Curated annotation (Swiss-Prot):
Belongs to the osteocalcin/matrix Gla protein family. Gamma-carboxyglutamate residues are formed by vitamin K dependent carboxylation by GGCX. These residues are essential for the binding of calcium. Decarboxylation promotes the hormone activity. Ca(2+) 3 binds at E8, D14. Ca(2+) 2 binds at E5, E8. It is found in: Secreted. The gene is BGLAP. Residues 1-31 form the Gla domain. It comes from the Eukaryota. This is Osteocalcin. Ca(2+) 1 binds at E1. The modification 4-carboxyglutamate is found at E1, E5, E8. The chain holds residues 68 to 100 of 100 of the full protein. Disulfide bonds join C7-C13. The carboxylated form is one of the main organic components of the bone matrix, which constitutes 1-2% of the total bone protein. It acts as a negative regulator of bone formation and is required to limit bone formation without impairing bone resorption or mineralization. The carboxylated form binds strongly to apatite and calcium. The uncarboxylated form acts as a hormone secreted by osteoblasts, which regulates different cellular processes, such as energy metabolism, male fertility and brain development. Regulates of energy metabolism by acting as a hormone favoring pancreatic beta-cell proliferation, insulin secretion and sensitivity and energy expenditure.
Length: 33
């Protein structure tokens, strides 16, 4: 699953996903622009 693949690498994205899940963490880190 590509979102988890990208986010789980990045320590800050993965840490956020620990709290709010990969969909929300990915949207926060890689959504804008």
């Amino acid at each position: 699953e590509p979102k988890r693949e990208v986010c789980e690498l990045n320590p800050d994205c993965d840490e956020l996903a620990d709290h709010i899940g990969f969909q929300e963490a990915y949207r926060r880190f890689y959504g804008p622009v």
